[PDB]
Enzyme design. Structure first.
Site, PDB file in Angstrom:
ATOM      1  N   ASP A   1       2.258   0.229  -7.359  1.00 21.63           N
ATOM      2  CA  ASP A   1       1.033   0.688  -8.023  1.00 21.63           C
ATOM      3  C   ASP A   1       1.345   1.111  -9.439  1.00 21.63           C
ATOM      4  O   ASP A   1       1.868   2.216  -9.657  1.00 21.63           O
ATOM      5  CB  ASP A   1       0.400   1.845  -7.225  1.00 21.63           C
ATOM      6  CG  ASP A   1      -0.871   2.389  -7.860  1.00 21.63           C
ATOM      7  OD1 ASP A   1      -1.401   1.773  -8.810  1.00 21.63           O
ATOM      8  OD2 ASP A   1      -1.349   3.434  -7.369  1.00 21.63           O
TER       9      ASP A   1
ATOM     10  N   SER B   1      -7.772  -4.837 -24.752  1.00 26.77           N
ATOM     11  CA  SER B   1      -8.097  -6.252 -24.750  1.00 26.77           C
ATOM     12  C   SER B   1      -8.995  -6.577 -25.946  1.00 26.77           C
ATOM     13  O   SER B   1      -9.813  -5.761 -26.380  1.00 26.77           O
ATOM     14  CB  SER B   1      -8.765  -6.657 -23.423  1.00 26.77           C
ATOM     15  OG  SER B   1      -9.372  -7.929 -23.533  1.00 26.77           O
TER      16      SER B   1
END
Length: 330
Positions: free
Chosen positions: A35, A199
């Site tokens: 994770d 992004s």
């Protein structure tokens, strides 16, 4: 040194991925959820409330000649999906795909929430976010990656998750045969303890690319792709019959639909998520209404590039002095 381990979807939907981990002497092999959104290595154990264990493999520290109780240490964590767990701490030997750390904090569950109990395929979590998020008290502990870093050929690990298929976590090296074209690296902020990046925008199917900054985290421990409501609305508007359902808790769509792809930007590069990756099947057994793999992050507080996005890429988690993230198509 290096390590390489195969990671496998736990079910037909790729709801999560498990990776085998050796703990203790002799080895006890547990299948953990790697994770990059958390920083605790915790395991079902011989100490876990009996009623809260159902099918998981447990870590028995009394059977490990290298296990040492970390005196006074406790841990307790709650995840973004409302699940939680807690217990005490040992240090022990932990190996992943041939890579070994001695004295790794192994967090032994005394309590877990029902969602963990219900998931018989996940024996624990292995956190790979920054050690600043580790919940061990009163002395915070380091992640497996942090502990191994200095010994690795290169201070990196890579995530190569599969779509309905096995994939790979590599430690210490970049497998140049595992991706196409080049790796585009992008800046990371560690200020919230996450692999947080920005992004450069998105496209829906064959549509034009929208340049826009989307701040979010690379999180292997999250199943879906969580993005701003505007983006998510733009995507599902291209799917006939798609709607946001309050009762179900997100966008649903007719199971007879063909989903468009979703592209996200990494600097000037583009990662294309095929539309099939965005289908998470019937909302209930036998239903013709299917759950979408792109959902709104509104009310999460952060955007999450989870498995839906990451499995479309070869992802480098670069733990150099100044950490960065790399993405390549594959």
């Amino acid at each position: 040194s290096t390590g390489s381990a195969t990671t496998t979807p736990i079910d037909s939907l790729d709801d999560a991925y498990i990776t085998p981990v050796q703990i203790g002497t002799p080895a006890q092999t547990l299948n953990l959820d790697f994770d990059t959104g958390s920083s605790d290595l915790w395991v079902f154990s011989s100490e876990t409330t009996a009623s809260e264990v159902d099918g998981q493999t447990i870590y028995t520290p009394s059977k490990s000649t290298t296990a040492k109780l970390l005196s006074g240490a406790t841990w307790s964590i709650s995840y973004g999906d409302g699940s939680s767990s807690s217990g005490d701490v040992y240090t022990d030997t932990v190996s992943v795909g041939g890579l070994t750390v001695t004295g790794q904090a192994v967090e032994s569950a005394k309590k877990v929430s029902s969602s963990f109990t219900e998931d018989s395929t996940i024996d624990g979590l292995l956190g790979l976010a920054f050690s600043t998020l580790n919940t061990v008290s009163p002395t915070q502990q380091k992640t497996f990656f942090d502990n191994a870093k200095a010994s690795l050929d290169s201070p990196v690990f890579t995530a190569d998750l599969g779509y309905h298929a096995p994939g790979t976590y590599n430690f210490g090296f970049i497998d140049t045969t595992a991706y196409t074209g080049s790796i585009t690296y992008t800046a990371v902020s560690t200020k919230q303890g996450f692999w947080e990046w920005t992004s450069t925008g998105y496209a829906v199917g064959s549509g034009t690319f929208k340049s826009t900054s989307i701040d979010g985290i690379a999180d292997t421990g999250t199943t879906l792709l969580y993005l701003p409501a505007t983006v998510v609305s733009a995507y599902w508007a291209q799917v006939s019959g798609a709607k946001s359902s309050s009762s179900v808790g997100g966008y649903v769509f007719p199971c007879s639909a063909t989903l468009p792809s979703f592209t996200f930007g990494v600097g000037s590069a583009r990662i294309v998520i095929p539309g099939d990756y965005i289908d998470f099947g019937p909302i209930s057994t036998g239903s013709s209404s299917c759950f979408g793999g792109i959902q709104s992050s509104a009310g999460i507080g952060i955007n999450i590039f989870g498995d839906v996005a990451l499995k479309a890429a070869f992802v480098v988690f670069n733990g150099a002095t100044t950490p960065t993230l790399g993405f390549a198509s594959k």
